[PDB]
Design a protein around this ligand. Structure first.
Ligand SMILES: *[C@@H]1O[C@H](CO)[C@@H](O)[C@H](O)[C@H]1NC(C)=O
Ligand SMILES: *[C@@H]1O[C@H](CO)[C@@H](O)[C@H](O)[C@H]1NC(C)=O
Lengths: 49, 62
């Protein structure tokens, strides 16, 4: 769900689409993630790794 | 995630891309308000290759 499960009923949200809305909350346009979401995933997991 | 039209990827400037069964609409994240996709409702940047999950559809130019 993302940020929804704290307000009320938890609505399902695709995780690739959740990030684009989290990026849009930092003044970064949505298409920044979608154009290079493979790098985002490859880089997020490495940091967690 | 996006709408493909004429080889150009359309992203919603604000709201979410949704469809019921056939027709595509853009609506906000806190209230289902269906409105037909319009040039003033989306912004185009790039092509239909970098994104994953893009959907072929028509866009109505005002
Ligand atoms: C979706 O909604 C549009 C207009 O609201 C309608 O014309 C269309 O028939 C609907 N499709 C389905 C599958 O309900
Ligand atoms: C969208 O249409 C183009 C050209 O007709 C085609 O190359 C592409 O595969 C289509 N995309 C989908 C998801 O069907």
């Amino acid at each position: 769900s993302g940020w929804t499960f704290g307000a009320g009923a938890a609505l399902q949200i695709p995780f690739a689409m959740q990030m684009a809305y989290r990026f849009n909350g930092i003044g970064v346009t949505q298409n920044v993630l979608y154009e290079n979401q493979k790098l985002i995933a490859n880089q997020f997991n490495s940091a967690i790794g | 995630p996006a709408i493909c039209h004429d080889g150009k990827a359309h992203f919603p400037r604000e709201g979410v891309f949704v469809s019921n069964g056939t027709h595509w609409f853009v609506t906000q994240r806190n209230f289902y308000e269906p409105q037909i996709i319009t040039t003033d409702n989306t912004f185009v940047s790039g092509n239909c290759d970098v994104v994953i999950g893009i959907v072929n559809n028509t866009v109505y130019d005002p």
